[PDB]
Amino acid sequence: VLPNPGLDARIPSLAELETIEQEEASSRPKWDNKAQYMLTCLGFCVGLGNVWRFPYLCQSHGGGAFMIPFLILLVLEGIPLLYLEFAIGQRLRRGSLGVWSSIHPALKGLGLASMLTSFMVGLYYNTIISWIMWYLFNSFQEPLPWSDCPLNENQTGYVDECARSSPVDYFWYRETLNISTSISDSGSIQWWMLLCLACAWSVLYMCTIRGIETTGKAVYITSTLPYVVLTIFLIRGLTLKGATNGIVFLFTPNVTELAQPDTWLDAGAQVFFSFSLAFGGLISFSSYNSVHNNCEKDSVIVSIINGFTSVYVAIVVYSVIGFRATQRYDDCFSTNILTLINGFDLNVTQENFVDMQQAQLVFQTCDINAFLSEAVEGTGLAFIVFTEAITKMPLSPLWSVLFFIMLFCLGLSSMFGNMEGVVVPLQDLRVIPPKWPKEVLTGLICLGTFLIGFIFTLNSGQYWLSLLDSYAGSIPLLIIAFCEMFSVVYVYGVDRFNKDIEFMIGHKPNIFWQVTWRVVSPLLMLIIFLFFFVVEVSQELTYSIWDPGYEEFPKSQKISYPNWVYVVVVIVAGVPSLTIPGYAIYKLIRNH
Amino acid sequence: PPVSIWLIVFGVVMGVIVVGIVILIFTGIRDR
Ligand SMILES: *[C@@H]1O[C@H](CO)[C@@H](O[C@@H]2O[C@H](CO)[C@@H](O)[C@H](O)[C@H]2NC(C)=O)[C@H](O)[C@H]1NC(C)=O
Numbered sequence: 001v002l003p004n005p006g007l008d009a010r011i012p013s014l015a016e017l018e019t020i021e022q023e024e025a026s027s028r029p030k031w032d033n034k035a036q037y038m039l040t041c042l043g044f045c046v047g048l049g050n051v052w053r054f055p056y057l058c059q060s061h062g063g064g065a066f067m068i069p070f071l072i073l074l075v076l077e078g079i080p081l082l083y084l085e086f087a088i089g090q091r092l093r094r095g096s097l098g099v100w101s102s103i104h105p106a107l108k109g110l111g112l113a114s115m116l117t118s119f120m121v122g123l124y125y126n127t128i129i130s131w132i133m134w135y136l137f138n139s140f141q142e143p144l145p146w147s148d149c150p151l152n153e154n155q156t157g158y159v160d161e162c163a164r165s166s167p168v169d170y171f172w173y174r175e176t177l178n179i180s181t182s183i184s185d186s187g188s189i190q191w192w193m194l195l196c197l198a199c200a201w202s203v204l205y206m207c208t209i210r211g212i213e214t215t216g217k218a219v220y221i222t223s224t225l226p227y228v229v230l231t232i233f234l235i236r237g238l239t240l241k242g243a244t245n246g247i248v249f250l251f252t253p254n255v256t257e258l259a260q261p262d263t264w265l266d267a268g269a270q271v272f273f274s275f276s277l278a279f280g281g282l283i284s285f286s287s288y289n290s291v292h293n294n295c296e297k298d299s300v301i302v303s304i305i306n307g308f309t310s311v312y313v314a315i316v317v318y319s320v321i322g323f324r325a326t327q328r329y330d331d332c333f334s335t336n337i338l339t340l341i342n343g344f345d346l347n348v349t350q351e352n353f354v355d356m357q358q359a360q361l362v363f364q365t366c367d368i369n370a371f372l373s374e375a376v377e378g379t380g381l382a383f384i385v386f387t388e389a390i391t392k393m394p395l396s397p398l399w400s401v402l403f404f405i406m407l408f409c410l411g412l413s414s415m416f417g418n419m420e421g422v423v424v425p426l427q428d429l430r431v432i433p434p435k436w437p438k439e440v441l442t443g444l445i446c447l448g449t450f451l452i453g454f455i456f457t458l459n460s461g462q463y464w465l466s467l468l469d470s471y472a473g474s475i476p477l478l479i480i481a482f483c484e485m486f487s488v489v490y491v492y493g494v495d496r497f498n499k500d501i502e503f504m505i506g507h508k509p510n511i512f513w514q515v516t517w518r519v520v521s522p523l524l525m526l527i528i529f530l531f532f533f534v535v536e537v538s539q540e541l542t543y544s545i546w547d548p549g550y551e552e553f554p555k556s557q558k559i560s561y562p563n564w565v566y567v568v569v570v571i572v573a574g575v576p577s578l579t580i581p582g583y584a585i586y587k588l589i590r591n592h
Numbered sequence: 593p594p595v596s597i598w599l600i601v602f603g604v605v606m607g608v609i610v611v612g613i614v615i616l617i618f619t620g621i622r623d624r
């Protein structure tokens with residue numbers, strides 16, 4: 001509809017697509033089976049988010065009710081866009097920088113944005129994988145290292161900070177991170193953190209050394225193992241006393257939460273990341289399929305599995321949350337019973353305590369709801385909540401190994417996608433001599449992103465990661481995804497796209513696809529974009545700090561970010577969003 | 593413990609990984 005001339009003789013023709021696959025047998029990779037392509041896509045979509053983000057939001061944003069906004073946006077934005085990304089990739093026979101550049105020369109910024117976003121996300125996400133594999137290395141010992149406090153130098157009692165806090169909280173903030181009191185206090189590189197960072201980047205080079213050719217064998221385990229382990233954990237969790245109590249907790253409906261601009265923003269930003277859209281690895285992975293693959297049925301199957309996985313992992317996480325809260329509650333009541341029994345020389349059971357007890361004595365009032373409401377979101381759930389719950393289970397060191405290989409596999413499959421998103425665009429820019437083998441490029445990305453990830457091994461390195469994690473996604477992905485849908489409907493033309501799809505699948509997209517590609521999806525992507533600048537003003541950009549030497553130390557302490565932090569937020573959220581106009585102003589005044 | 597368990601596991605895992613990378617780099621060279 002927008003007047004872009006010279007579009008033919010810049011893309012392959014439909015007449016020429018029947019002959020292009022018997023000549024891209026050489027010089028282009030090709031899946032070995034359809035299952036391999038299907039798995040790699042699943043691993044990209046299913047990630048650590050489905051463990052410590054989606055289950056939290058499901059409850060925080062109205063348990064069971066959150067399903068409404070999540071499923072609405074899933075079928076109105078997720079599937080619709082996922083299809084647009086699978087189809088355009090399989091039709092244009094190129095990755096993300098390839099496709100947008102071909103549709104219109106000024107749309108290159110779109111490709112650049114997707115590559116930048118993929119880099120920024122992969123940088124911090126592999127750092128999380130570095131922390132996962134730190135815990136897994138410490139998961140082969142009868143007494144898990146987060147089971148007990150370290151003794152004082154005098155061994156009179158436990159270390160003060162562990163004493164005031166918890167052995168688990170102590171193992172994360174002091175023995176893993178060695179965290180600082182601020183983002184402005186930065187120290188040295190935690191050598192053990194750097195070792196694990198090395199391990200993470202090295203494990204990812206080996207799977208991505210020769211592209212899909214090597215990642216295909218990897219996804220057979222990286223995308224399957226997590227389902228087996230997630231299953232083994234569901235049968236174990238349900239057996240544990242207190243589970244079901246935490247399932248009920250997840251699925252209690254608070255409709256009032258639906259009437260909130262913060263609910264749909266999260267539900268909206270969750271679908272995009274859960275579907276790994278606007279990263280431009282799904283376009284690259286779809287380009288390797290045959291020109292006549294059904295990419296309409298592949299987008300529905302992936303998106304069904306994505307929506308079933310999200311709920312299924314939430315059932316596993318809230319089974320542990322309910323066992324861990326049922327354990328603390330019983331421990332608390334036992335302590336209160338002991339106080340009365342010892343103080344009054346008393347027998348006393350939860351059934352007969354309040355009646356039995358009826359000034360010197362102190363009773364710590366505790367409610368299961370309060371223990372259940374202790375569920376957090378983001379790493380904390382894995383490094384604090386689960387790690388604690390697992391120490392109170394039989395065969396502790398075997399449930400820890402299985403939980404941290406599962407998280408490892410989740411993270412690693414996601415990394416395959418992000419790496420596809422950084423390397424492919426680099427080969428289309430032709431930054432390195434094309435003569436160079438693929439291993440060289442992938443090895444220079446894996447070594448260059450490793451060296452930048454030393455910022456997160458500083459003592460302040462978790463404060464930096466919590467900032468990038470809150471800005472790397474959201475705005476950039478929302479704007480990138482809005483312009484991919486715009487560029488595929490108003491610039492390439494939705495009429496040429498229907499014809500093309502009819503060419504491969506054999507028929508044209510139905511009215512559902514037409515309605516959502518033209519009017520609905522984009523409109524639904526503007527109100528999520530307007531919600532962002534509505535909630536942002538309430539952010540106050542404040543970050544929680546540990547600060548052992550602080551009043552109510554174990555209590556949350558939120559401090560405002562230093563003014564210079566705004567520069568960081570502008571660079572990680574703005575530059576990947578202003579390259580889309582920025583390259584389009586540069587190209588429109590290089591011709592004139 | 594005489595050696596930190598995490599370091600010995602780290603040791604064995606890194607070992608396999610690098611022996612993974614060596615072979616993969618060489619298999620590809622053979623493919624050439
Ligand atoms: C159900 O959701 C509503 C909406 O979020 C909750 O009411 C909010 O409570 C917080 C804390 O007091 C206030 O800051 C918000 O302004 C309230 N929102 C509205 C629209 O009133 C309510 O508490 C939730 N109910 C339960 C049981 O979780």
Ligand SMILES: *[C@@H]1O[C@H](CO)[C@@H](O)[C@H](O)[C@H]1NC(C)=O
Binds near residue numbers: 178179181
């Ligand atoms: C981190 O731990 C080292 C010893 O492992 C110590 O020198 C340093 O002071 C710690 N950092 C902070 C901020 O306490």
Ligand code: NA
Binds near residue numbers: 042043414
């Ligand atoms: Na994954």
